[PDB]
Structure formats: C-alpha cells, structure tokens
C-alpha cells in the first residue's frame, strides 16, 4: 500500500512463516462464526449450524485456502493491489454479489488469526503494517464495483 520499506520487510518476513492452508481455513471459518450473516454466500457448503460444524467443514477449509492463496499472491504486488485484483474485483461484484464490507471483516479476522498464531512475534508495529495491507486489499477488491 503506502508501506515503508521497514513495514514491507515486516509483512514479508512473517508471511514466509505462514502455513496458508491452516490460516486460510481458520480465517474463513472464524468469519462465518463471528459474523454469522457472512454465511449467506455459502449455503451450498452444508452445515454451518455450529462453530464446530463450520470449523470442520472441508468446503470451508478449501475455500479458505483458495482465498488466502490469492491474498498471498497479492503481497507480491504490493505496489499495485489495484491491478492485481482487478479481475477478482469484477467477479465479486458482477458474479458473486459480495458486499465489499465483507472484505473488511475478513481482513480483521485475518489479523486476529495471525496474532493467535504468532503470539509474541505479532507486535504492535507488525500489526500496524498488516492493518495497512488488509485495508489495501479490501480497497483493491472493491475498486471495480459499480
């Protein structure tokens, strides 16, 4: 985004320690649990009746990994999240009808998952840099809405 070389390094290095598989599945599951209305787009996934049911749902887990994957690829284009997510932005608008506010909710869930995971390592300054990243991503994804 408007990341300082120092802030850039901090993001980049923590990320290299992330198991996208597990983080993606937990971020997406936590979202469905903490903000239950987000479940409106995943009725076809199955039983989301309980935290246990969501956290366990493999369709949820696999969707999470796909989301974090694309997210992960975007950290490589931090100077152009806009151009990196242009097609995905059109898709979420035009095909999926996803309110971009959801992009913000996920961002924040993501940050709680990273903290959960890295405890100590996820310092105030490291969170500040991540907050700038999730905001930039949400903004890029919302960019082609009309």
């Amino acid at each position: 985004v408007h990341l300082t070389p120092e802030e850039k390094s901090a993001v980049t290095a923590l990320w290299g320690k992330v198991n996208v598989d597990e983080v993606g599945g937990e971020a997406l599951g936590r979202l469905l649990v903490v903000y239950p209305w987000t479940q409106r787009f995943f009725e076809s996934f199955g039983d989301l009746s309980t935290p246990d049911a969501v956290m366990g749902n493999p369709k949820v887990k696999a969707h999470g990994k796909k989301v974090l994957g694309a997210f992960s690829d975007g950290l490589a284009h931090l100077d152009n999240l806009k151009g990196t997510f242009a097609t995905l932005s059109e898709l979420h608008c035009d095909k999926l009808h996803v309110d971009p506010e959801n992009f913000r909710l996920l961002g924040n869930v993501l940050v709680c998952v990273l903290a959960h995971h890295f405890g100590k390592e996820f310092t105030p300054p490291v969170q500040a840099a991540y907050q700038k990243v999730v905001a930039g991503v949400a903004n890029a994804l919302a960019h082609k809405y009309h």
Binding site: E26, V33, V34, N108, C112, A115, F122, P124, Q127, Q131
Partner: protein, 140 residues
C-alpha cells in the same frame, strides 16, 4: 444480546487474563494508536510513546472497567452508567472509535491466550465488546 454461553465464554476468558489485565489494557491502546493513528486525536495531553506511564495507567483504567463489566455482565447498563455519562457528556469520543479499540483488544487477547481464544470464544468476546460499546455510547 449476550446468550448464557457467551457470558460463560467471556467470564472464562477474562478469568485467565487475571493479574495481566492492566498490561493487556496498555498493549491494546498501544496497538490502537499505531494501527489507527486518528484515535490519537483524543489524547493530545498524553505522552503516546512506548511504555509511557500515561498509557500504562490508562490501560489499567480501561481494563478495570472491562472487569467490572464482566462481573456485571447481566447489569451492564447499570454497572457502567457513570462511564456512559463521562463519554457522552465530557469526552465525546466519536462512536466509530469504539470498534477500533474493541478490535485491538481482541488482537491482544488472541496473542496472549492462544489456548482459550477459540472460534466460539472469539465470537463471544466480540459481541461483549460490542455490547460494552453500545452502553458506552447509549447517552450520546
């Protein structure tokens, strides 16, 4: 609208915070100031530097009120009336900021209570902080 499970979840999690609540209070503020620099507009009279005694002290203050609220989870409106007053009539913090502090508190708890920060506990704590925010901004 906190369910019985939620109150249980909150009482448990907070239970583990214990003697560290003040420190978490302080760390949450520190994360807020760094992550959402606009929040600093309400503390021009504070030294916002890392490990500042003002932030530390205020962190304690915030923690204690949250503790008092867990203890009166059932009678929040009443246990926090004076605080509701102070914010509505004196401090006059814009309501959007309550969501920024709440978020930073979650992050803080996550980072320090790995085992206890389950998805269901995370959901409960979120609703609690939301409830507390509502009360605190109810007399605006």
């Amino acid at each position: 609208v906190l369910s019985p499970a939620d109150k249980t979840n909150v009482k448990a999690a907070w239970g583990k915070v214990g003697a560290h609540a003040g420190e978490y209070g302080a760390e949450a503020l520190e994360r807020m100031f760094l992550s959402f620099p606009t929040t600093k507009t309400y503390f021009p009279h504070f030294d916002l530097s890392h490990g500042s005694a003002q932030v530390k002290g205020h962190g304690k203050k915030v923690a204690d009120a949250l503790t008092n609220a867990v203890a009166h989870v059932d009678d929040m409106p009443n246990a926090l009336s004076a605080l509701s007053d102070l914010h509505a009539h004196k401090l006059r913090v814009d309501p959007v900021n309550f969501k920024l502090l709440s978020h930073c508190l979650l992050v803080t708890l996550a980072a320090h209570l790995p085992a206890e920060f389950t998805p269901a506990v995370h959901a409960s704590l979120d609703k609690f902080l939301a409830s507390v925010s509502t009360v605190l901004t109810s007399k605006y």
